[PDB]
């Protein structure tokens, strides 16, 4: 079926910042979706996306001030890479990338993802998934990475508590997506922002994405209880944050987010120039272009 037939999920004129990025600025956390025609969505995908290809990425990047993309692979292409190996090539070295893997991916595979421009993998322990989820592959597959490898993880706070024994036998750096989804509306010290700390302070090499507002705070923008919420923890860890657009959104089709006021809300979380650096620049890079670092 049609792109026109597909789901949109992004806004096709995004709004200019308000907020101008460092000269650097890494958005951590991005994904393509086909193009179809290449790049075929895996027959597991139940509602498919429109096309956002490598491209729009890099114009999206441009519009918003930023220098380089992580790009994470997206759910509907599964276990296929094609279209993430594909936009990290075309970036010209802007990009870097995070892959979703079959844990019986043998060491040639993963080896031929790192030469890709894939630096780590993604779990992603949905509420429908976590109880169907083979937790030991998973960490099998996990210990056995290409060197300097981390570990994405998305989950929500209902389940942090159950999931701690499998996030402490990780043997490599771990990142958590949208930190966890934390609910912002009960404040910096909130419940989840607690439980949150007590993961972070668990193990040192345990980074978050201080992202998407848009999936966290039912109020929309301007997003005050995420900007409220969310802004002490970046304080708290300044070494260990970065921060992504998460454009195209996946599945946000019913609250499509502005780009532009997605970026504005960096100087809120990060307000001092030194805090921005850390988060877009330094961080960013420290993690997905280590061998440049130093």
């Known amino acids: 079926l049609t792109n026109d037939e597909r789901i949109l999920s992004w806004n096709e004129t995004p709004s200019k910042p308000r907020y101008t990025p460092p000269p650097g600025a890494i958005d951590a956390h991005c994904h393509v979706f086909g193009p179809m025609a290449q790049f075929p969505f895996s027959p597991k995908a139940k509602y498919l996306p ?13 519009h918003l001030g930023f220098a380089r993309n992580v790009i994470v692979q997206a759910s509907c292409h599964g276990t296929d890479n094609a279209a993430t190996l594909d936009a ?4 010209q070295g802007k990009a870097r990338g995070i892959a979703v893997v079959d844990p019986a991916i043998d060491e040639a595979e993963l080896a ?3 030469e890709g421009g894939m630096r780590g993998i993604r779990f992603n322990f949905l509420k429908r998934l976590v109880d169907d989820a083979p937790k030991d592959k998973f960490l ?10 981390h570990v994405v993880i998305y989950f929500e706070a209902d389940i942090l508590e159950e999931l701690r024994p499998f996030m402490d036998a990780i043997p490599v750096p771990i990142v958590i997506d949208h930190m966890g989804r934390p609910d912002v509306r009960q404040g910096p010290d909130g419940a989840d922002m607690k439980a949150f700390r007590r993961l972070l302070d668990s193990r040192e090499d345990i980074w978050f994405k201080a992202t998407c507002p848009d ?4 109020a929309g923008p301007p997003w005050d209880d995420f900007a409220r919420s969310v802004a002490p923890l970046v304080a708290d860890y300044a070494d260990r944050v970065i921060w992504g657009t998460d454009w195209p959104h996946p599945n946000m089709q019913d609250a499509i987010p502005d780009d532009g006021l997605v970026v504005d809300m960096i100087p809120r979380i990060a307000p001092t120039p030194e805090l921005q650096h850390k988060m877009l620049v330094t961080n960013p890079m420290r993690l997905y272009w280590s061998e440049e670092m130093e």
């Open 112 to 114: 031929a993802l790192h």
């Open 215 to 218: 999936r966290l705070d039912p």
């Open 50 to 62: 429109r096309d956002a290809g490598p491209d729009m990425l890099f114009a999206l990047r441009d």
């Open 140 to 149: 099998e597959v996990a210990g056995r990475l290409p060197a300097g490898w």
């Open 88 to 91: 990290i090539a075309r970036a």
